[PDB]
Amino acid sequence: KSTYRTPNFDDVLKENNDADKGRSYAYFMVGAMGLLSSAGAKSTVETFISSMTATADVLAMA
């Protein structure tokens, strides 16, 4: 068999590749994952930093 014959890939290929929209769906999901994890990173940092503020008993004697 010759090396110039490409094997069968028709199980996995698209409607038409349509590069306008093969890039659309992959990058909406990569953008959503970066949006949620940047919000989660903020909430984590602000939870740890606020623990260093004056406690309830110190504010009661304020």
Partner 1 sequence: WRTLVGVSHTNEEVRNMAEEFEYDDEPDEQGNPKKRPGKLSDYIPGPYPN
Ligand X SMILES: CCCCCCCCCCCCCC(=O)O[C@H](COC(=O)CCCCCCCCCCC)COP(=O)(O)O
By CB under 8 A, name the binding residues for partner 1. 56-57, 60-61
Binding partner at 31 among partner 1, ligand X, none, C-beta below 5 to 8 Å by kind = none
The binding site for ligand X (CB under 6 A) comprises 37, 40-41, 43-44, 47
Q: Which two tokens stand for residue 28?
A: 């909406």
Least distance in angstroms from the C-beta of 32 to ligand X: 14
Contact present, 14 and 22 (Cβ < 8 Å): yes
Q: Under 8 Å CB-to-CB from 14, ≥6 apart: which residues?
A: 22
Least distance in angstroms from the C-beta of 48 to ligand X: 7
